[PDB]
Ligand binder design. Structure first.
Ligand SMILES: c1ccc(CNc2nc(Nc3cc(C4CC4)n[nH]3)c3sccc3n2)cc1
Length: 343
């Protein structure tokens, strides 16, 4: 027996469908499993609503890590207040049979689910524009100095949709998140969405999230991840195909520079001859987007909001979000003033 019979050998709560916790939560099913522990779908009898409960493992390590998450979730709750910034907010937390329990809103679809509903051909630049304004709004919120939060894991899997309030998304999972300055790491973000500064072992700040958003916006409208590397070297080759050799002022300061590039005798940087690759900067965004050919594989030809001028506005935005230099990558405030959003 562990935790009086309520826990398994591995510090996790033994989930039984139908259990009433404190005459308030009727548990329906396990819906989630992670290093942190378990997520459950439950009916909150008092608020007459479905909720998702994150049961943290019964272990000092995981409890204090989850208590870091609770700090950020609640700081994100002091600000905001009217739940209007596309963040899946913490409704509350309680201790039940020696497990920390975070209660969240239940949402049953992520961005992925919406791209399988398109057989991965993607969505109108009109819908992309809507989500983009939602995501950018969220990153603007996260960049409030008091917050200065880095999500560190933006990906379609972590972007949930409000079916009820159709054409609305929310960012989820702040368990991998950290605050500006907290202390640099080295292997963060989902590979496909991983910033060049992180690939290069350099320091990072809120801009890594804007990078990940650039790659998600393209993947929303093409149906296809922009940069699907099978390891870090392939990932950085796939980036260079599109954006060229990173500038010198960046590579000259990058610990992992030589894991991908080689400094020639004249001081100029180049790639390394070990799957061969387009030469640098020749898989153009202008073409992937189909800017002059009615969108990716010219599918939205004619359709309102898919004019050349629309795509010149979109490409300019993406390319500003995919800047190699995190000092000059577009920040969410100027990103919201972009013409791609304007009348
Ligand atoms: C385990 C389970 C869930 C997560 C967050 N990912 C997630 N959450 C969902 N639902 C969910 C989570 C939440 C908050 C508990 C975090 N509300 N609703 C859904 S519905 C379809 C895919 C999907 N992916 C992370 C680990």
């Amino acid at each position: 027996v562990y935790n009086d019979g309520y826990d398994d050998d591995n510090y996790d709560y033994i989930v039984k469908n139908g259990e009433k916790w404190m005459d308030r939560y009727e548990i329906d099913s396990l819906i989630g499993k992670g290093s942190f522990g378990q997520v459950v779908k439950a009916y909150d009898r008092v608020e007459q609503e479905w909720v998702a409960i994150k049961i943290i493992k019964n272990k000092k390590a995981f409890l204090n890590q989850a208590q870091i998450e609770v700090r950020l979730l609640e700081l994100m709750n002091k600000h905001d207040t009217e739940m209007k910034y596309y963040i899946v907010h913490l409704k509350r937390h309680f201790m039940f049979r020696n497990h920390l329990c975070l209660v969240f809103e239940m949402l049953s679809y992520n961005l992925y689910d919406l791209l399988r509903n398109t057989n991965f051909r993607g969505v109108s630049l009109n819908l992309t524009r809507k989500f983009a304004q939602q995501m950018c709004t969220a990153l603007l919120f996260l960049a409030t100095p008091e917050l200065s939060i880095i999500h560190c894991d933006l990906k379609p899997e972590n972007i949930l949709l409000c079916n009820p309030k159709r054409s609305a998304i929310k960012i989820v999972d702040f368990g991998s998140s950290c605050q500006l300055g907290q202390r640099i790491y080295q292997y963060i973000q989902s590979r496909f969405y991983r910033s060049p500064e992180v690939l290069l072992g350099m320091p990072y700040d809120l801009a890594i999230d804007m990078w990940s958003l650039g790659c998600i916006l393209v993947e929303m409208h093409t149906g296809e991840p922009l940069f699907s590397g099978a390891n870090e070297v392939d990932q950085m080759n796939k980036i260079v195909e599109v954006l060229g050799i990173p500038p010198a002022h960046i590579l000259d300061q990058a610990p992992k520079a030589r894991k991908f590039f080689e400094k020639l005798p004249d001081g100029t940087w180049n790639l390394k001859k070990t799957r061969e690759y387009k030469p640098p900067g020749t898989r153009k965004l202008h073409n992937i987007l189909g800017v002059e050919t009615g969108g990716p594989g010219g599918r939205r030809a004619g359709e309102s909001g898919h004019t050349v001028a629309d795509y010149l506005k979109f490409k300019d935005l993406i390319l500003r979000m995919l800047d190699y230099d995190p000092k000059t990558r577009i920040q969410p405030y100027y990103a919201l003033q972009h013409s791609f959003f304007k009348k």
